[PDB]
Design a protein around this ligand. Structure first.
Ligand code: CLA
Ligand code: CLA
Ligand code: CLA
Ligand code: CLA
Ligand SMILES: CCCCCCCCCCCC(=O)OC\C(C#C[C@@]12O[C@]1(C)C[C@@H](O)CC2(C)C)=C/C=C/C(C)=C/C=C/C=C(C)/C=C/C=C(\C)C=C=C1C(C)(C)C[C@H](OC(C)=O)C[C@@]1(C)O
Ligand SMILES: CCCCCC(=O)OC\C(C=C=C1C(C)(C)C[C@H](OC(C)=O)C[C@@]1(C)O)=C/C=C/C(C)=C/C=C/C=C(C)/C=C/C=C(\C)C(=O)C[C@@]12O[C@]1(C)C[C@@H](O)CC2(C)C
Ligand SMILES: CC(=O)O[C@H]1CC(C)(C)C(=C=C/C(C)=C/C=C/C(C)=C/C=C/C=C(C)/C=C/C=C(\C)C(=O)C[C@@]23O[C@]2(C)C[C@@H](O)CC3(C)C)[C@](C)(O)C1
Ligand SMILES: CC(=O)O[C@H]1CC(C)(C)C(=C=C/C(C)=C/C=C/C(C)=C/C=C/C=C(C)/C=C/C=C(\C)C(=O)C[C@@]23O[C@]2(C)C[C@@H](O)CC3(C)C)[C@](C)(O)C1
Ligand code: KC2
Ligand SMILES: CC1=C(C#C/C(C)=C/C=C/C(C)=C/C=C/C=C(C)/C=C/C=C(C)/C=C/[C@@]23O[C@]2(C)C[C@@H](O)CC3(C)C)C(C)(C)C[C@H](O)C1
Ligand SMILES: CC1=C(C#C/C(C)=C/C=C/C(C)=C/C=C/C=C(C)/C=C/C=C(C)/C=C/[C@@]23O[C@]2(C)C[C@@H](O)CC3(C)C)C(C)(C)C[C@H](O)C1
Lengths: 193, 179, 222, 228, 171, 187
């Protein structure tokens, strides 16, 4: 099975595959690559979202003005929760448009993670090789190219760190949202959440 | 990073890197670091020279900056962040657009981009239009590049000393309390 | 450990009482696991409860006599003269939730296969040492001391002394689980412990209720 | 072994007591570093604390009794008769900053690989002498005098004498630590150092906040005071 | 193996996105038993919703509680409004059929399908048995397919009636 | 044998795999009753008309207008043009092109065995090329334009709104511009 070879097993669960429900044993390898790709996607989105929520709750905002009429602090003066509404429609439209472009490109690369590809290694130069489209060769992952200074063993260690931090952030972001929704749910979250 | 320029006698004879970002940096990451260092150097040197010249009783340019709106060079006060504030927004956009065109050029024209081989901080269009440094020895050019980096590091500390003076009065000694 | 090992342990703890399991927990297979692992879990439970109860006995004496830390604001916030059970209820719930989560992190550290097998021991249910606590050698970040003997004492103790100490640990734990509960029962039920009448301050709340506001229904946040 | 050397050093410090590590700090793996590095750090901390406490004791006698340089400088804003805790509080804020910063530069030079390597030595946590301040032989601009033995009074001293001097340094540093905090403790928990009762005045103010009170913001420079 | 069994028909044919029986073909019989079970419960549930829409029984649900059949709404509110004794009797009957009458599994804890039986052949001797092989296969395929459509539909009705209070969504 | 587009049906024999845009999609086997070249001519004519219609509708609705033309949305543009008078003029080139290129080409397709394929008028003044990939792009763009025009007309008539042709505008295409505060509530 492909499960025994993947990363993600850590010292916390005794260095064993944490699958109480046994779905990893049940489903085929193809679904397992889907699950690892989705795991890393959720984990990276959550590692972005958790620090975003921290910054919003601290009310740390860039100096300037998002639109020509609203300030970054004006949007953030109602906590992270009531922020996406206060963002202008055009700004979030552009954000979601570039996210759509990235998603479509990463899915459109030929060596798909399911059908013979590394799960979670979305291609580092999306929008390249597209007929009738030119974009700068800004490497999506690590455009400064910090990876070049790391050997494969260090990359494996940092991928383990990636998975563990992603899992913790997926817990933390929902913790923040739940702390806002239900006031007493998560302790150690102040009224800003 | 040991091969790259910048290690004068002023920090031993070795690289200055407490945090060790150069250790993380690969060759192309070090190229990015040097390119960013150089661009900050050059922009800072221009900024600090302009601030000093304007706010040290230098001769403001003659005539009207904008004849249509009536804004004049003399009307723009010789004070940091007031002259820029009173400059027309169209003029601000002119400066920013020319800078943006030039920077997209310096990114798209250089062929072996500083990232993929190449030399960080080389912009053939703007440097030496009169060719002032076209017959210097390679050593001399290396020495002058070292001088460039050293002057610019000081310049980028100085421009922030000016900025933090306006935004936080009496931050810098030997500088007016206002700006 | 085998039931023969439990009989030997009981006969070394108290030769006269000997093995005195009258409910056969030592024989009931817990979760279907072998007797050698049910014995491990039960013995770890005995040691752990005795540990917590000995600490609780000393802590109850300390709280009833209001020997509090001098340089903290939570202790000052808690009113003086309260019963020791109430000195727990009068605390911010966020501090209770961090005491409990500290024990959670420590008991996650203890049962970890990797840390135990790195230090040499195994789980108490896997034939390991019941009542062992691995040090923080494999911790993500460095830390100054371990839990058991943060200082050095008993780094050079004989196995005979360790065996004597484990026997005394089990016996004192069995006694302290009864002493601390004598305090609680006399507090919440006057005239229940006949010898502490007029000694233990009375109490109305539930000692098995850690947080004032019910976490399952309506918690409080900070 | 580093612990063997430390144990012998303890016997030299006091042979009746000997090695007394009640917490096992030598054995503890600080930062994950091995026992040699940990003992190097602990020894360096001991001599650093002792040195600074000895200087602090002599400075307490100097400041409290009244011992000031003449002329323009920080001493002209400290009120006369001020307590030793009040002298630091009364010197200018920039004076406090520059004292702490100069000490920082000295510490940085002390742990710099540059100076220690120019002197043919290594960091105290990586097989070096714990408590060795290097010569300023890599300070870009030459400096006239070094910190330790500036006039080079000990240019020819026996290694046995130097070892005995380090044994003395540790002992006197420990004793000076105790005395200096005796002074500090008598001012905030009276009747704690019995001999000092009535001698050390009470001080209302945090010792461990360096910059509280921030002190005056005066400008004591006279000629060329364009920054005022 | 599994690619040619009752259920490997329709537009998709064999359909294992997450490779369950591909990884564990031994568990296909258990999965078929579970699919038949859920499908049948859902057929009953969908017909119950559709028929409770227009027809309701007469007489009192519980004369002591004064709860009438027509007074109940059509949805989860009806099961809420059944008295506790009625719910207990309902659970008792369902458990009797589950454990004794129509045993889907043979024994132990992780129940296997009965040995001398099909995956979901739970009826006794008095049950319709088809002897034509083609008709038997066709109608078993119809059973499982209608069951699948029924569970999709029943999940739809349950979610609609949870959101709104009526299984019919507006439109 | 089994069709690619429909993996539970046999593909027809007329489709084969030479024709551009061939995806084995013909569940009703209409290629047997209707000739494939005639059907392709009709497909390409419809595709081209729908492409032009989509781009013209979008431009006119966004605001681009000819001088002297009525400043109206694309929905009322037909009625406005008919009322103002100049709209048979556009029929005149349509009538010319159809009568003198479609009727003869249609008769050649049906009767003449040696004839150009459906939709091939040899109209390449720039010489961009009639490569296989180019024809595939033409067919795909055309079909997408047919469906897009159908949606555009049916939605502009329904809502009588701006270019998005949805009740709440771009918010319908993009749900997370609506609130997201109920999504965060359930989370
Ligand atoms: C939704 C995100 C998500 C996804 C897709 C995965 C996916 C995976 N995890 Mg899991 N994991 C997650 C969240 C997720 N994880 C979180 C938050 C944690 C921290 C507690 C972990 C901790 C964890 C460990 C420690 C390990 C895995 C492993 C695995 C793999 C095998 C199990 C499996 O088939 O999971 C498929 C997952 C799903 C179908 C998602 C479950 C969806 C339900 C409805 C959620 C239930 C509600 C909540 C409680 C697989 C790649 C193992 C591995 O890496 O093996 C090599 C492994 O050892 N995960
Ligand atoms: C009125 C609007 C409009 C117009 C004029 C076109 C025009 C074109 N589309 Mg289409 N397209 C449209 C809307 C439109 N599209 C919409 C709304 C979608 C849905 C997202 C698509 C999705 C789409 C795809 C997926 C593809 C096309 C392609 C093409 C090109 C085919 C010929 C070619 O390769 O030329 C030679 C190529 C060029 C001159 C380079 C492209 C020029 C610009 C950037 C386009 C052509 C330029 C095909 C193509 O090759 O695009 C590159 C193609 O692959 N289009
Ligand atoms: C943003 C400006 C900037 C940038 C991009 C760099 C970049 C570089 N410097 Mg540095 N340098 C700077 C400003 C900058 N410097 C200034 C102002 C000084 C004067 C104090 C120096 C003094 C200096 C020396 C003496 C040397 C270097 C060298 C280097 C190189 C290796 C160290 C490294 O990885 O730095 C990476 C730097 C960054 C990633 C930016 C730091 C970002 C933090 C958050 C800013 C903190 C500052 C704080 C707000 C005030 C690298 C090309 C060495 C070299 O060239 O070796 C051949 C070398 O010898 N620099
Ligand atoms: C109770 C749920 C259930 C169960 C146990 C099964 C079981 C089965 N189905 Mg499936 N099926 C279901 C629901 C279920 N189905 C529904 C609702 C539909 C309608 C779309 C279908 C439609 C369907 C078709 C068209 C086919 C099957 C087939 C099969 C068999 C293939 C092996 C497999 O992967 O099954 C294992 C499946 C499970 C254990 C269910 C896992 C569900 C997880 C926990 C949640 C998924 C997320 C969300 C609910 C969606 C097996 C007997 C194939 C067959 O018979 O091949 C011979 C086949 O051709 N099923
Ligand atoms: C401009 C210059 C650009 C610089 C580029 C650098 C760059 O961006 O690098 C990006 C980058 C990198 C990099 C490297 O390439 C570098 C630089 C060099 C190379 O060697 C290595 C790599 C890696 C390749 C990484 C990024 C990682 C991130 C973002 C991780 C984010 C991670 C957020 C989490 C965990 C959030 C967690 C939230 C939690 C735990 C929430 C919570 C709580 C609390 C509230 C705490 C309390 C509560 O407690 C109770 C209830 O009691 C419990 C709980 C759970 O509810
Ligand atoms: C005596 C005990 C008998 C128990 C068994 C029984 O009676 O079997 C009876 C039986 C067969 C049989 C046999 C007989 C020959 C007749 C009797 C013999 O019996 C004996 C004992 O010999 C043998 C047997 C059992 O073989 C057949 C039962 C068939 C049944 C009960 C089939 C339901 C499908 C529902 C579907 C697909 C729902 C889709 C639902 C969907 C897609 C939706 O929900 C859609 C929708 O709603 C949504 C979501 C919202 C609405 O706005 C809109 C609509 C409406 C569109
Ligand atoms: C009513 C009537 O009729 O009767 C009774 C009822 C009742 C309620 C039962 C009564 C009571 C009171 C009782 C019986 C109370 C019992 C309390 C109990 C039994 C409390 C133990 C604490 C132990 C601790 C904290 C040990 C720490 C030990 C530690 C942390 C060690 O260092 C262990 C050590 O091994 C190392 C690691 C290193 C070695 O070098 C040796 C040492 C030792 C240092 C009354 C009032 O009397 C009357
Ligand atoms: C910051 C501020 O405001 O500061 C203020 C306050 C402050 C600091 C207190 C001030 C002060 C006071 C200061 C600094 C006073 C300094 C006084 C000073 C410097 C006094 C030296 C006397 C030396 C003698 C008599 C040597 C005789 C030496 C003799 C006999 C020889 O020459 C002998 C010999 O060499 C020959 C000729 C050559 C050879 O053949 C033989 C030898 C070698 C044997 C100021 C000035 O107010 C400034
Ligand atoms: C608050 C809690 C607490 C209390 C009140 C308490 C009381 C007593 C008494 C009572 C008079 C004795 C006499 C005693 C003796 C020993 N205790 Mg003990 N102990 C507590 C906590 C822990 C922890 C966390 C550990 C531990 C251990 C040992 C060992 C080592 C044996 C060995 O190394 O073989 C010996 C000899 C360590 C271990 O491994 O125990 C198997 C270990 O990890 N204890 N302990
Ligand atoms: C001796 C010794 C040691 C020591 C020591 C100690 C205590 C050293 C202390 C040193 C100290 C405290 C040194 C201050 C310098 C101040 C300067 C340079 C200020 C210049 C100021 C200038 C240049 C200002 C100029 C201007 O305003 C002017 C005048 C007018 C204008 O025209 C121009 C401007 C505006 C710019 C070691 C090495 C530690 C150990 C060793 O063992 C023994
Ligand atoms: C809309 C809305 C909201 C919402 C919402 C959400 C999340 C809605 C989600 C709806 C969803 C998820 C609806 C799925 C339907 C699936 C169907 C009908 C599938 C049937 C499929 C069937 C019957 C399959 C049958 C077959 O298997 C059979 C039997 C045999 C095989 O041979 C053939 C096939 C495979 C075909 C808010 C957020 C709450 C508020 C907002 O304001 C408005």
């Amino acid at each position: 099975a492909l499960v025994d070879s993947m990363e993600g097993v850590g010292e916390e669960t005794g260095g064993q595959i944490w699958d109480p429900l046994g779905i990893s044993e049940a489903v085929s390898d193809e679904a397992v690559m889907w699950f690892r790709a989705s795991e890393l996607k959720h984990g990276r989105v959550a590692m972005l979202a958790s620090v975003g929520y921290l910054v919003g709750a601290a009310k740390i905002s860039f100096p300037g003005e998002l639109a020509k009429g609203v300030t970054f602090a004006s949007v953030a003066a109602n906590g992270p929760y009531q922020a996406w509404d206060a963002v202008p429609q055009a700004g979030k439209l552009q954000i979601l448009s570039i996210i759509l472009a990235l998603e479509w490109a990463t899915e459109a690369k030929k060596p798909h993670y399911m059908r013979g590809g590394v799960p979670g290694k979305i291609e580092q130069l999306p929008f390249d090789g597209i007929q009738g489209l030119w974009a700068p060769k800004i490497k999506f992952w690590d455009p400064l190219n910090f990876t070049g200074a790391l050997s494969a063993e260090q990359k494996a260690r940092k991928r383990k760190a990636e998975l563990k931090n992603g899992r913790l952030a997926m817990i933390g972001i929902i913790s923040f949202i739940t702390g806002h929704n239900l006031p007493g749910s998560v302790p150690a979250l102040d009224s800003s959440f | 990073v040991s091969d790259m320029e910048g290690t004068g006698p002023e920090t031993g004879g070795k690289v200055f890197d407490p945090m060790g970002l150069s250790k993380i940096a690969s060759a192309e990451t070090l190229a990015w670091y040097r390119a960013a260092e150089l661009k900050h150097s050059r922009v800072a040197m221009a900024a600090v020279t302009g601030w000093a010249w304007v706010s040290s009783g230098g001769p403001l340019f003659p005539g009207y900056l904008s004849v249509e709106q009536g804004v004049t060079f003399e009307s723009l006060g010789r004070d940091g962040y007031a002259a820029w504030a009173a400059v027309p927004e169209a003029g601000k956009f002119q400066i920013l657009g020319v800078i943006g065109i030039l920077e997209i050029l310096s990114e798209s024209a250089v062929k072996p981009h500083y990232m993929a081989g190449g030399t960080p901080g080389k912009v053939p269009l703007l440097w030496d239009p009169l060719g002032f440094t076209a017959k210097l020895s390679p050593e001399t050019l290396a020495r002058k590049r070292l001088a460039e980096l050293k002057n610019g590091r000081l310049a980028m500390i100085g421009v922030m000393s000016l900025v933090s003076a306006h935004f936080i009065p009496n931050s810098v000694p030997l500088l007016p309390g206002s700006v | 450990e085998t039931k023969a090992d439990l009989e030997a342990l009981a006969k070394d703890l108290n030769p006269a009482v000997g093995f005195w399991d009258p409910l056969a927990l030592s024989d009931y297979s817990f979760w279907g696991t072998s007797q050698e692992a049910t014995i491990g879990f039960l013995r770890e439970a005995e040691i752990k409860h005795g540990r917590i109860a000995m600490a609780g006995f000393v802590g109850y004496i300390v709280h009833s006599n209001d020997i509090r830390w001098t340089f903290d604001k939570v202790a000052a916030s808690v009113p003086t003269g309260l019963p020791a059970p109430a000195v727990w209820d009068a605390i911010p719930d966020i501090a209770k939730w961090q005491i409990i989560l500290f024990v959670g992190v420590m008991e996650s550290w203890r049962e970890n296969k990797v840390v135990l097998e790195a230090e040499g021991q195994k789980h108490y249910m896997s034939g390991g040492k019941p009542g062992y606590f691995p040090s923080f050698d494999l911790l993500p970040h460095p830390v100054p001391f371990p839990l058991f003997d943060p200082f050095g004492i008993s780094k050079r103790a004989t196995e005979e002394k360790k065996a004597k100490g484990r026997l005394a640990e089990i016996n004192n734990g069995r006694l302290a689980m009864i002493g601390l509960f004598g305090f609680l029962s006399e507090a919440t039920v006057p005239g229940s412990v006949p010898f502490l009448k007029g000694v233990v301050p009375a109490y109305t709340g539930e000692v098995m209720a850690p947080f004032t506001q019910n976490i399952f229904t309506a918690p409080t946040a900070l | 072994s580093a612990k063997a050397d430390l144990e012998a050093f303890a016997k030299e410090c006091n042979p009746v007591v000997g090695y007394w590590d009640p917490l096992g700090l030598a054995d503890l793996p600080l930062w994950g570093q091995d026992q040699d590095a940990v003992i190097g750090w602990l020894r360096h901390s001991e001599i650093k604390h002792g040195r600074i406490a000895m200087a602090g004791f002599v400075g307490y006698i100097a400041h409290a009794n009244g011992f000031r340089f003449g002329g323009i400088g920080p001493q002209n804003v400290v009120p006369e008769g001020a307590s030793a805790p009040e002298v630091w509080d009364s010197i200018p804020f920039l004076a406090k900053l520059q004292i702490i910063g100069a000490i920082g530069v000295l510490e940085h030079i002390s742990e710099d690989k540059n100076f220690l390597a120019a002197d043919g030595m290594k960091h105290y946590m990586r097989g070096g002498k714990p408590g060795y301040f290097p010569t300023f032989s890599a300070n870009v601009h030459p400096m006239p005098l070094n910190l330790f033995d500036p006039f080079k009074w000990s240019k020819n001293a026996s290694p046995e004498k130097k070892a005995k001097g380090l044994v003395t340094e540790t002992n006197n540093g420990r004793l000076a630590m105790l005395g200096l905090f005796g002074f500090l403790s008598e001012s905030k928990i009276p009747g704690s150092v019995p001999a000092l009762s009535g001698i050390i005045p009470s001080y209302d103010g945090d010792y461990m906040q360096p910059f509280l009170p921030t002190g005056p913001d005066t400008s004591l420079w006279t000629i060329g005071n364009l920054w005022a | 193996g599994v690619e040619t069994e009752l259920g490997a028909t329709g537009p998709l044919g064999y359909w294992d996105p997450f490779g369950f029986s591909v990884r564990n073909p031994e568990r296909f019989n258990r999965y078929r038993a579970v699919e038949l079970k859920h499908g049948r419960i859902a057929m009953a549930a969908t017909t119950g919703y559709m028929v409770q829409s227009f027809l309701r029984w007469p007489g009192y649900l519980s004369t002591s509680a004064n709860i009438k059949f027509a007074d109940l709404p059509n949805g989860i509110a009806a099961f809420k409004a059944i008295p506790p004794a009625g719910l207990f009797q309902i659970l008792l009957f369902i458990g009797a059929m589950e454990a004794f009458t129509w045993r889907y599994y043979e024994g132990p804890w992780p129940g296997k399908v009965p040995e001398g039986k099909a995956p979901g052949d739970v009826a006794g001797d008095l049950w319709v048995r088809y002897t034509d092989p083609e008709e038997k296969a066709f109608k078993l395929n119809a059973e499982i397919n209608n069951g699948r459509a029924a569970m999709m539909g029943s999940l739809g009705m349950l979610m609609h009636d949870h959101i709104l209070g009526t299984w019919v969504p507006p439109g | 044998a089994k069709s690619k587009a429909i993996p539970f049906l046999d593909a027809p024999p007329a489709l084969d795999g030479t024709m551009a845009g061939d995806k084995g999609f013909d569940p009703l086997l209409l290629s047997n009753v209707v000739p494939i070249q005639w059907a392709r001519e009709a497909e390409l004519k419809h595709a081209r008309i729908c492409m032009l219609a989509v781009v013209g509708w979008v431009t006119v609705d966004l605001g681009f207008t000819v001088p002297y033309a009525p400043q109206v949305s694309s929905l009322a543009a037909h009625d406005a043009a008919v009322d103002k008078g100049v709209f048979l003029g556009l029929l005149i080139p349509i009538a010319l092109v159809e009568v003198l290129a479609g009727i003869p080409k249609c008769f050649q397709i049906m009767n003449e065995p040696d004839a150009s394929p459906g939709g091939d008028y040899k109209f390449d003044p720039l010489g961009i090329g009639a490569s296989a990939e180019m024809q595939e792009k033409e067919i795909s763009n055309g079909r997408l334009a047919m469906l897009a025009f159908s949606g555009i007309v049916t939605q502009a008539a329904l809502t009588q709104g701006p270019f998005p042709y949805t009740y709440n505008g771009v918010e319908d295409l993009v749900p997370p511009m609506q609130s997201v505060q109920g999504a965060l509530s359930i989370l």
